Amino acid sequence: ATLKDQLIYNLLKEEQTPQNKITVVGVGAVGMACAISILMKDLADELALVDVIEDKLKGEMMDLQHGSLFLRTPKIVSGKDYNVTANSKLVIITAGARQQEGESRLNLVQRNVNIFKFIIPNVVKYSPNCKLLIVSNPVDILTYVAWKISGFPKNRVIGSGCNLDSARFRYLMGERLGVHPLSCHGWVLGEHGDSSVPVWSGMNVAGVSLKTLHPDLGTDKDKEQWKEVHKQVVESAYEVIKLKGYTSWAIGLSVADLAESIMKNLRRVHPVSTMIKGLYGIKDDVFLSVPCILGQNGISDLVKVTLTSEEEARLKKSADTLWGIQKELQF
Amino acid sequence: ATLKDQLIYNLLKEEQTPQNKITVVGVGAVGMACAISILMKDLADELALVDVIEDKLKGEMMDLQHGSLFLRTPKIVSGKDYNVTANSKLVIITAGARQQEGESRLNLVQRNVNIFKFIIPNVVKYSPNCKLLIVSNPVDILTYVAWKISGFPKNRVIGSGCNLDSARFRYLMGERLGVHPLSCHGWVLGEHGDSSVPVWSGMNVAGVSLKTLHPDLGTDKDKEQWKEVHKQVVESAYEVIKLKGYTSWAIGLSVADLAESIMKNLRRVHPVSTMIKGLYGIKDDVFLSVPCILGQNGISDLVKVTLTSEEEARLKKSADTLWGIQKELQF
Amino acid sequence: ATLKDQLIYNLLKEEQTPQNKITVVGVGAVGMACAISILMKDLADELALVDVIEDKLKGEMMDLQHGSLFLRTPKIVSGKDYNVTANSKLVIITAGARQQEGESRLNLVQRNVNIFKFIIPNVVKYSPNCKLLIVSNPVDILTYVAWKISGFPKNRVIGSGCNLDSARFRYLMGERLGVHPLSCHGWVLGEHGDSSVPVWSGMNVAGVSLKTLHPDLGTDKDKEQWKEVHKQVVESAYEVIKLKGYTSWAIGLSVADLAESIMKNLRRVHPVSTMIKGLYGIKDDVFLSVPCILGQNGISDLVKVTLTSEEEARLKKSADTLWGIQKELQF
């Protein structure tokens, strides 16, 4: 008899079905940051990695596996075939084309659509009940694309949206005030990136309205120039990209935070990208970041934030731009 | 009055001395894996990053800072000047030279020595009471170098040594037996890399000696070829390097495990590289991996593993090789 | 419209089926220690508490609920009706009768049987696929009882058995050696309590056999009297009971450790009580503690520990005693 059979008496042939499985698609810096963050928060009993570059994929998988002693996620697998993703509760999509210099936004989105036309039906085939969390940029449009291709109901297709931007906002707020960002409250909503909307009316510490204490907050008459905070939020990513080449750690952490609300059914509120038609005067199928209640069924509820006519106007303009692109897309 | 002063009443101007500070030197893939692993285990109240490449350094720092909302380490700093490292309890060195094409080993090692002649006195100046953890390769030699340059007592200079190799060994063992590596015990000792020694006599599950059940275990007559496991331990790292270009996650996790024993004064036993002269038959000032008890004073105690004459012979040969290299070095 | 409906837009009416639910039966000190340990390790998305004393039950539930802000288990429920336990993955039984003055052991055990005849079919009705973890004393016998009543296969009925005794053993060993118990290995097997068997041959640090270094280890000629360690393992529990009235924290922590292996499918090895007929020379349907691999299907595999004829004799004597009691029982 083998050493194993001398040492160990087997009771069960186990038809291994994963109970809390997560898949990350794309093993670039973003995908791997998501993976390590997920592994270190014990959110999954099985982690699957998928990418088209087989050697890099295998290398990342093995590197993680070699750290198993220090983790509590007993199964880490990878493959270019989507059968490795079967029965995932949550599938995180980070794959996508990188925008070349002089490439139009439309062209970039169409390249990503061509990628998603392959990824999404494969994901859906093997995990028809999963939640989709889209991290790939441009996230609002790509969440829309994932939604269109998957045929999933809207509660189950979520874009990372302005979750990280809101985290950055709160970090900068905390630095200005000398308070941990957990205790600084403020929301960045709408379209991820330059057009996002900082909701000044909601910024507070301990329930104290900053806008109330300082009525010129976020305006051009503001002597403390709080507008810059938002400008910094918008530009931070660029700066990080200018400095180290890309951004990864912060995105990975924010994505793991989302994953945690979903996998643990927390019903926390996160600013994520969701199908917003019928709100704020928006009449098209577009996805924008609003505060959403996240749980085991994805987005169950939305918070209705009261906005100024100017803030609503920004949202509508974003919706118009997004739709102007989306209607050109070939599925 | 400013918004801050309308919102916040200050009681104290605080000369904040960090109480649980860790420094990582080198922000390549290894250093950043160490940093993220440390941040996600809440081991430090302040993390300092140091490197000579300033833009990359700043970018990595900012990327981590942007995730502050999701972390419990309130201060992350960086700089090329070592004054940012002041008052660290633990300093982790991952920096080192990369071997150029056609450069001899002695030359490469000498370049690392010259680098350490700058790094180490700077580290010691600002944190004279710290523990030094050397991760840079070749790790046994560079740990010797750090020890010589720092003038620290030997309990406070630790090389990562065979900690990860032992973790890999336990992973592979776990895969062969169908058991989590936490419950599979086995030690890889001696010189990190090709010359390491798998201590077959200690391999066990639930205290059951595998060698006793299978006396040919690890020999050439072993029909199950357990030798291959050790071979894979040695080679897997090369494989990962061939597949993805480098290794990072597993080393980061194992280093964070070491850091955890040190920062929490756990007195767990880890196979790390220590100045082993006067034990195990070793007669030169060399560092080799043995099981060490790690706590807040670094290595306070060593486990004396009973070895066969053949295992002892391998350790002595490693010591002779290491000393043969070290005596060529100029300090 | 209500405030909620002005604030929140609902997308979904959710039939929420909990995905990682745990039930604790009995809210005495042991049950509540288990509950708090489970809540602080984030093992469950729903925790159900059950007991016959309704006011105490409700109070404990509310007290836990009031700490929800500090926890990551979004649903805590309680009730005397077992419908609150529906769809549990793991059900932990701590309930049992207390021996009255002048009541025989057989009588006490029979009362526990009669209690289990109510509890177990109710548990099974609402969670037919759960794992049962029996903590109630006398644990080997009551685990047998739960197994008989439930009709579950043996992989799914687990007694806490000698898990805590082994933890205590490793603590005492750690105290003697100056090493954390995580790095001190030793197994207490067989019948929980006075008759348990310390397996001296497996006691080790870093794979170094203590028995090999010290052949008299655990015998009567042992000048260091390591036997006393086992004695203390047996007696410490009495001592704690004499000192504070009962024991709770350590058992709660050890049970949460078991739960963690089960809920996360870890396949770690734990010394738990399992139906051991056909192994270790045992010929009756009795439960004894051996090292078991624990995962999502309960006990999937057992480690076959090499024992001396004397150790085997002790196990057989325990089996005969247990069967001698069990055959008097009426189901």
Add this chain to the structure above:
Amino acid sequence: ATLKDQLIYNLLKEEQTPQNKITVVGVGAVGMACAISILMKDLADELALVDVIEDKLKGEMMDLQHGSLFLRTPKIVSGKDYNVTANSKLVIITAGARQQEGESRLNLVQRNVNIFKFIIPNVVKYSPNCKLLIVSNPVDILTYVAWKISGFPKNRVIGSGCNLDSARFRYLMGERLGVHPLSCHGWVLGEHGDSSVPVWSGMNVAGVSLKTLHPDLGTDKDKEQWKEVHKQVVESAYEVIKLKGYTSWAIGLSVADLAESIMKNLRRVHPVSTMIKGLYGIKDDVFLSVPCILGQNGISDLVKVTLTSEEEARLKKSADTLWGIQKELQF
């Protein structure tokens, strides 16, 4: 040579100085709930327990020690002599007299003063640099007493105050709205207990003011009777006490949350009891709960919450009552 000395080579005689030590005074249900919560959050490298009932104290200590394998706090000690508390960073006081039926508030406070006159100088003697966290009831007065006796500056004497009441408020808010309490914001301030002040103006989700959406919020004209939420907060403890005899778990969790901000220097904002003279028109040395920034030096800063004249009036009346008692105290 002993087995230990054969197995282990000692490098260091360690003058053991704790780096992150916490003391809990009082091992009643509250003290032990604090202790288990602290142990499970890895906030201390050493935990000291102190109480006057020696057998109960020893029993609790041993019970915790037996769970060491499952914890990462390597030293747990206890004693009636305060020398066991030496060099604590944080000392949590839960000891105190229990109010008898018909005992006046003044008489109860004086009994507690007599207890504190023994406890506090002993604590201060052995840990002159510690932060004091007073949990004993009535907490506002006893924090004042601890402050007077210790001679500590006010940043270093903190009362648990309305931290738990605010947590309960947020729990109830979450239940009314279907949102996790982490995402529900609301503050209970002032005097702990019936006279506490729910700050309706600050209640919000995602920065959306509930008071703005529902102007009658918290008034007698409120058709949804949100006032009841506060009444429930006030009464919850009584109910829990009526049901199970006392309250423990929630307090333990909230206290551990405070301890975490202090031990990790987080600078989070918590509603804790602090010396409030010179604010809200208060002219006496009284302690009330306001939002405080908590870190390694205790309370470094206060948030200035804008209150209505009615809310201020409630605070002033509380201050008057507290002072009316405090001026009768004999030190």
